[PDB]
mmCIF file of all heavy atoms in Angstrom:
data_model
loop_
_atom_site.group_PDB
_atom_site.id
_atom_site.type_symbol
_atom_site.label_atom_id
_atom_site.label_comp_id
_atom_site.label_asym_id
_atom_site.label_seq_id
_atom_site.Cartn_x
_atom_site.Cartn_y
_atom_site.Cartn_z
ATOM 1 N N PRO A 1 28.110 9.695 -4.954
ATOM 2 C CA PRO A 1 26.890 9.294 -4.209
ATOM 3 C C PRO A 1 25.846 10.373 -4.290
ATOM 4 O O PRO A 1 26.118 11.548 -4.651
ATOM 5 C CB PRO A 1 27.485 9.214 -2.764
ATOM 6 C CG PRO A 1 28.557 10.311 -2.713
ATOM 7 C CD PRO A 1 29.086 10.413 -4.170
ATOM 8 N N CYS A 2 24.640 9.993 -3.901
ATOM 9 C CA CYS A 2 23.427 10.764 -4.065
ATOM 10 C C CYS A 2 22.687 10.769 -2.796
ATOM 11 O O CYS A 2 22.551 9.805 -2.055
ATOM 12 C CB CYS A 2 22.545 10.131 -5.174
ATOM 13 S SG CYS A 2 21.068 11.176 -5.662
ATOM 14 N N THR A 3 22.020 11.936 -2.548
ATOM 15 C CA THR A 3 21.009 12.090 -1.481
ATOM 16 C C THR A 3 19.909 11.167 -1.419
ATOM 17 O O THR A 3 19.469 10.761 -0.402
ATOM 18 C CB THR A 3 20.478 13.595 -1.550
ATOM 19 O OG1 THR A 3 21.579 14.463 -1.300
ATOM 20 C CG2 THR A 3 19.335 13.865 -0.693
ATOM 21 N N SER A 4 19.529 10.676 -2.671
ATOM 22 C CA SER A 4 18.510 9.584 -2.801
ATOM 23 C C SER A 4 18.965 8.375 -2.017
ATOM 24 O O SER A 4 18.012 7.737 -1.371
ATOM 25 C CB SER A 4 18.224 9.297 -4.192
ATOM 26 O OG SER A 4 17.630 10.461 -4.827
ATOM 27 N N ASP A 5 20.215 7.952 -2.042
ATOM 28 C CA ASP A 5 20.576 6.706 -1.257
ATOM 29 C C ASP A 5 20.458 6.990 0.195
ATOM 30 O O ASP A 5 20.183 6.039 0.919
ATOM 31 C CB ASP A 5 21.957 6.311 -1.692
ATOM 32 C CG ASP A 5 21.968 5.537 -2.988
ATOM 33 O OD1 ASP A 5 20.827 5.226 -3.525
ATOM 34 O OD2 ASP A 5 23.136 5.156 -3.475
ATOM 35 N N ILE A 6 20.504 8.240 0.722
ATOM 36 C CA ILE A 6 20.263 8.558 2.138
ATOM 37 C C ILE A 6 18.784 8.413 2.492
ATOM 38 O O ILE A 6 18.459 7.803 3.499
ATOM 39 C CB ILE A 6 20.929 9.968 2.528
ATOM 40 C CG1 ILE A 6 22.383 9.993 2.141
ATOM 41 C CG2 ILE A 6 20.673 10.293 3.964
ATOM 42 C CD1 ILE A 6 23.236 8.998 2.816
ATOM 43 N N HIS A 7 17.897 8.917 1.640
ATOM 44 C CA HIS A 7 16.491 8.602 1.817
ATOM 45 C C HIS A 7 16.191 7.162 1.852
ATOM 46 O O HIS A 7 15.501 6.682 2.801
ATOM 47 C CB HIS A 7 15.708 9.225 0.637
ATOM 48 C CG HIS A 7 15.766 10.800 0.564
ATOM 49 N ND1 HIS A 7 15.919 11.590 1.641
ATOM 50 C CD2 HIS A 7 15.735 11.579 -0.563
ATOM 51 C CE1 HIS A 7 15.918 12.807 1.276
ATOM 52 N NE2 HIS A 7 15.787 12.861 -0.045
ATOM 53 N N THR A 8 16.844 6.519 0.941
ATOM 54 C CA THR A 8 16.541 4.975 0.791
ATOM 55 C C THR A 8 16.976 4.206 1.978
ATOM 56 O O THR A 8 16.216 3.513 2.614
ATOM 57 C CB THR A 8 17.105 4.476 -0.507
ATOM 58 O OG1 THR A 8 16.471 5.155 -1.604
ATOM 59 C CG2 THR A 8 16.906 2.884 -0.620
ATOM 60 N N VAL A 9 18.289 4.492 2.430
ATOM 61 C CA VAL A 9 18.805 3.791 3.569
ATOM 62 C C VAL A 9 18.277 4.326 4.889
ATOM 63 O O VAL A 9 17.958 3.436 5.826
ATOM 64 C CB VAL A 9 20.408 3.887 3.607
ATOM 65 C CG1 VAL A 9 20.860 3.164 4.745
ATOM 66 C CG2 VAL A 9 20.985 3.310 2.260
ATOM 67 N N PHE A 10 18.361 5.577 5.116
ATOM 68 C CA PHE A 10 18.157 6.081 6.396
ATOM 69 C C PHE A 10 16.732 6.546 6.761
ATOM 70 O O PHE A 10 16.281 6.762 7.856
ATOM 71 C CB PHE A 10 19.159 7.235 6.727
ATOM 72 C CG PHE A 10 20.632 6.741 6.888
ATOM 73 C CD1 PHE A 10 21.382 6.841 5.789
ATOM 74 C CD2 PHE A 10 21.011 6.048 7.928
ATOM 75 C CE1 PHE A 10 22.695 6.289 5.895
ATOM 76 C CE2 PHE A 10 22.246 5.491 8.006
ATOM 77 C CZ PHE A 10 23.197 5.614 6.963
ATOM 78 N N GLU A 11 15.949 6.704 5.652
ATOM 79 C CA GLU A 11 14.531 6.959 5.900
ATOM 80 C C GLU A 11 13.648 5.764 5.534
ATOM 81 O O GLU A 11 12.443 5.747 5.888
ATOM 82 C CB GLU A 11 14.000 8.148 5.126
ATOM 83 C CG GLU A 11 14.599 9.405 5.749
ATOM 84 C CD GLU A 11 14.510 10.712 4.910
ATOM 85 O OE1 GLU A 11 14.058 10.554 3.770
ATOM 86 O OE2 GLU A 11 14.781 11.757 5.428
ATOM 87 N N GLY A 12 14.235 4.700 4.852
ATOM 88 C CA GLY A 12 13.360 3.566 4.407
ATOM 89 C C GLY A 12 12.311 4.016 3.454
ATOM 90 O O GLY A 12 11.237 3.460 3.350
ATOM 91 N N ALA A 13 12.642 5.007 2.624
ATOM 92 C CA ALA A 13 11.590 5.721 1.779
ATOM 93 C C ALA A 13 11.122 4.839 0.703
ATOM 94 O O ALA A 13 10.009 5.196 0.138
ATOM 95 C CB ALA A 13 12.129 7.052 1.311
ATOM 96 N N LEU A 14 11.773 3.816 0.301
ATOM 97 C CA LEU A 14 11.189 2.852 -0.694
ATOM 98 C C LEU A 14 11.074 1.464 -0.136
ATOM 99 O O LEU A 14 11.025 0.530 -0.983
ATOM 100 C CB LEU A 14 12.097 2.912 -1.956
ATOM 101 C CG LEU A 14 11.962 4.211 -2.797
ATOM 102 C CD1 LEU A 14 12.976 4.243 -3.840
ATOM 103 C CD2 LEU A 14 10.509 4.319 -3.382
ATOM 104 N N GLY A 15 11.101 1.346 1.132
ATOM 105 C CA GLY A 15 10.941 0.082 1.869
ATOM 106 C C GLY A 15 12.236 -0.563 2.240
ATOM 107 O O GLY A 15 13.359 -0.106 1.797
ATOM 108 N N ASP A 16 12.236 -1.662 2.927
ATOM 109 C CA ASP A 16 13.475 -2.343 3.370
ATOM 110 C C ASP A 16 14.168 -3.035 2.181
ATOM 111 O O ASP A 16 13.397 -3.379 1.171
ATOM 112 C CB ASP A 16 13.311 -3.286 4.575
ATOM 113 C CG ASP A 16 14.472 -3.309 5.448
ATOM 114 O OD1 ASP A 16 15.532 -2.877 5.125
ATOM 115 O OD2 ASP A 16 14.284 -3.730 6.654
ATOM 116 N N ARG A 17 15.466 -3.309 2.307
ATOM 117 C CA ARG A 17 16.297 -4.048 1.412
ATOM 118 C C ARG A 17 17.250 -4.945 2.154
ATOM 119 O O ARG A 17 17.428 -4.774 3.321
ATOM 120 C CB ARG A 17 17.151 -3.042 0.581
ATOM 121 C CG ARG A 17 16.187 -2.119 -0.346
ATOM 122 C CD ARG A 17 15.601 -2.795 -1.507
ATOM 123 N NE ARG A 17 14.921 -1.842 -2.415
ATOM 124 C CZ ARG A 17 13.757 -1.302 -2.161
ATOM 125 N NH1 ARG A 17 12.958 -1.632 -1.171
ATOM 126 N NH2 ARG A 17 13.279 -0.364 -3.001
ATOM 127 N N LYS A 18 17.777 -6.002 1.423
ATOM 128 C CA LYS A 18 18.861 -6.867 2.007
ATOM 129 C C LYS A 18 19.964 -6.872 1.209
ATOM 130 O O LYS A 18 19.898 -7.299 0.061
ATOM 131 C CB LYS A 18 18.355 -8.228 2.254
ATOM 132 C CG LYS A 18 19.338 -9.102 2.992
ATOM 133 C CD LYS A 18 19.062 -9.104 4.583
ATOM 134 C CE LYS A 18 17.751 -9.860 4.969
ATOM 135 N NZ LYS A 18 17.793 -10.521 6.244
ATOM 136 N N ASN A 19 21.143 -6.366 1.625
ATOM 137 C CA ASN A 19 22.377 -6.432 0.806
ATOM 138 C C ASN A 19 22.333 -5.902 -0.574
ATOM 139 O O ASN A 19 22.784 -6.447 -1.492
ATOM 140 C CB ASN A 19 22.844 -7.868 0.840
ATOM 141 C CG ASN A 19 23.562 -8.159 2.245
ATOM 142 O OD1 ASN A 19 23.562 -7.401 3.221
ATOM 143 N ND2 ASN A 19 24.240 -9.381 2.320
ATOM 144 N N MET A 20 21.823 -4.688 -0.732
ATOM 145 C CA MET A 20 21.752 -3.959 -1.959
ATOM 146 C C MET A 20 22.887 -3.027 -2.083
ATOM 147 O O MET A 20 23.015 -2.144 -1.344
ATOM 148 C CB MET A 20 20.395 -3.253 -2.188
ATOM 149 C CG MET A 20 20.329 -2.475 -3.484
ATOM 150 S SD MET A 20 18.720 -1.617 -3.793
ATOM 151 C CE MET A 20 19.005 -0.319 -2.505
ATOM 152 N N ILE A 21 23.770 -3.247 -3.160
ATOM 153 C CA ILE A 21 24.834 -2.411 -3.407
ATOM 154 C C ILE A 21 24.252 -1.017 -3.854
ATOM 155 O O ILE A 21 23.278 -0.919 -4.583
ATOM 156 C CB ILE A 21 25.770 -3.019 -4.440
ATOM 157 C CG1 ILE A 21 26.407 -4.237 -3.899
ATOM 158 C CG2 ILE A 21 26.776 -1.958 -5.101
ATOM 159 C CD1 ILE A 21 27.245 -5.003 -4.893
ATOM 160 N N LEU A 22 24.859 0.043 -3.302
ATOM 161 C CA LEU A 22 24.361 1.353 -3.524
ATOM 162 C C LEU A 22 24.975 2.006 -4.716
ATOM 163 O O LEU A 22 25.830 1.488 -5.354
ATOM 164 C CB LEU A 22 24.510 2.185 -2.269
ATOM 165 C CG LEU A 22 23.692 1.763 -1.018
ATOM 166 C CD1 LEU A 22 24.135 2.308 0.205
ATOM 167 C CD2 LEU A 22 22.148 2.053 -1.304
ATOM 168 N N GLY A 23 24.444 3.296 -4.957
ATOM 169 C CA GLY A 23 25.005 4.144 -6.124
ATOM 170 C C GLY A 23 24.402 3.962 -7.459
ATOM 171 O O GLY A 23 23.997 2.780 -7.853
ATOM 172 N N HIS A 24 24.120 5.058 -8.110
ATOM 173 C CA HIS A 24 23.504 5.104 -9.458
ATOM 174 C C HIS A 24 24.092 6.150 -10.357
ATOM 175 O O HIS A 24 23.500 6.509 -11.351
ATOM 176 C CB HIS A 24 22.043 5.103 -9.390
ATOM 177 C CG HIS A 24 21.493 6.152 -8.490
ATOM 178 N ND1 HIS A 24 21.048 5.898 -7.176
ATOM 179 C CD2 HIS A 24 21.285 7.451 -8.680
ATOM 180 C CE1 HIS A 24 20.709 7.030 -6.652
ATOM 181 N NE2 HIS A 24 20.809 8.048 -7.549
ATOM 182 N N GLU A 25 25.345 6.531 -10.011
ATOM 183 C CA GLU A 25 25.930 7.668 -10.856
ATOM 184 C C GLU A 25 27.421 7.254 -11.211
ATOM 185 O O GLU A 25 28.267 7.217 -10.294
ATOM 186 C CB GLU A 25 25.981 8.988 -10.080
ATOM 187 C CG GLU A 25 24.610 9.589 -9.973
ATOM 188 C CD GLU A 25 24.604 10.592 -8.858
ATOM 189 O OE1 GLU A 25 24.424 10.090 -7.668
ATOM 190 O OE2 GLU A 25 24.630 11.800 -9.058
ATOM 191 N N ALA A 26 27.595 6.792 -12.454
ATOM 192 C CA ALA A 26 28.904 6.247 -12.887
ATOM 193 C C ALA A 26 29.092 6.459 -14.267
ATOM 194 O O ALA A 26 28.252 6.602 -15.129
ATOM 195 C CB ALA A 26 28.914 4.730 -12.544
ATOM 196 N N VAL A 27 30.449 6.709 -14.535
ATOM 197 C CA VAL A 27 31.089 6.530 -15.821
ATOM 198 C C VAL A 27 31.906 5.283 -15.645
ATOM 199 O O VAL A 27 32.511 5.023 -14.602
ATOM 200 C CB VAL A 27 31.969 7.667 -16.290
ATOM 201 C CG1 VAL A 27 33.066 7.274 -17.318
ATOM 202 C CG2 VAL A 27 31.138 8.745 -16.880
ATOM 203 N N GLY A 28 31.962 4.336 -16.672
ATOM 204 C CA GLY A 28 32.558 3.103 -16.569
ATOM 205 C C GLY A 28 33.271 2.663 -17.905
ATOM 206 O O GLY A 28 33.243 3.242 -18.860
ATOM 207 N N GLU A 29 33.969 1.476 -17.719
ATOM 208 C CA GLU A 29 34.554 0.834 -18.830
ATOM 209 C C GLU A 29 33.757 -0.535 -18.955
ATOM 210 O O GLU A 29 33.675 -1.254 -18.086
ATOM 211 C CB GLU A 29 36.062 0.537 -18.629
ATOM 212 C CG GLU A 29 36.680 -0.151 -19.769
ATOM 213 C CD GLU A 29 38.144 -0.433 -19.572
ATOM 214 O OE1 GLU A 29 38.871 0.375 -18.857
ATOM 215 O OE2 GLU A 29 38.601 -1.495 -19.962
ATOM 216 N N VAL A 30 33.431 -0.743 -20.273
ATOM 217 C CA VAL A 30 32.728 -2.021 -20.532
ATOM 218 C C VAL A 30 33.826 -3.052 -20.488
ATOM 219 O O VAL A 30 34.865 -2.950 -21.214
ATOM 220 C CB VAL A 30 32.010 -1.900 -21.888
ATOM 221 C CG1 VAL A 30 31.445 -3.278 -22.389
ATOM 222 C CG2 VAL A 30 30.912 -0.851 -21.949
ATOM 223 N N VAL A 31 33.523 -4.082 -19.683
ATOM 224 C CA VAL A 31 34.379 -5.237 -19.609
ATOM 225 C C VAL A 31 33.841 -6.436 -20.359
ATOM 226 O O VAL A 31 34.667 -7.225 -20.829
ATOM 227 C CB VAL A 31 34.818 -5.584 -18.136
ATOM 228 C CG1 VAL A 31 35.535 -4.330 -17.506
ATOM 229 C CG2 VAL A 31 33.687 -5.988 -17.315
ATOM 230 N N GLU A 32 32.578 -6.559 -20.510
ATOM 231 C CA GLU A 32 31.966 -7.780 -21.088
ATOM 232 C C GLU A 32 30.580 -7.391 -21.624
ATOM 233 O O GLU A 32 29.833 -6.742 -21.013
ATOM 234 C CB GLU A 32 31.946 -8.788 -19.946
ATOM 235 C CG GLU A 32 30.956 -9.937 -20.078
ATOM 236 C CD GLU A 32 30.774 -10.695 -18.764
ATOM 237 O OE1 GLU A 32 31.732 -10.517 -17.944
ATOM 238 O OE2 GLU A 32 29.821 -11.402 -18.586
ATOM 239 N N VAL A 33 30.302 -7.858 -22.869
ATOM 240 C CA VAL A 33 29.030 -7.706 -23.535
ATOM 241 C C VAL A 33 28.395 -9.000 -23.898
ATOM 242 O O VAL A 33 29.046 -9.892 -24.281
ATOM 243 C CB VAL A 33 28.998 -6.720 -24.658
ATOM 244 C CG1 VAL A 33 29.723 -5.366 -24.211
ATOM 245 C CG2 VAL A 33 29.767 -7.384 -25.864
ATOM 246 N N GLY A 34 27.013 -9.111 -23.845
ATOM 247 C CA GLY A 34 26.408 -10.303 -24.380
ATOM 248 C C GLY A 34 26.465 -10.461 -25.942
ATOM 249 O O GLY A 34 26.908 -9.481 -26.665
#
């Protein structure tokens, strides 16, 4: 998790959102490609 998500959620620093899944820091496994 990131401090940015705290600004976003708890300060409303980029405006309101509805049901936005958080987080932007990941390593992953590709499950499906176009």
Side-chain angles (χ1 to χ4, degrees):
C2 190
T3 291
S4 295
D5 283 355
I6 303 306
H7 297 325
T8 297
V9 178
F10 292 99
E11 289 167 354
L14 285 172
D16 216 340
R17 297 290 188 276
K18 185 96 67 150
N19 283 9
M20 178 177 69
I21 294 174
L22 294 165
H24 50 264
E25 290 159 280
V27 156
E29 180 181 325
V30 173
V31 300
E32 159 192 340
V33 306

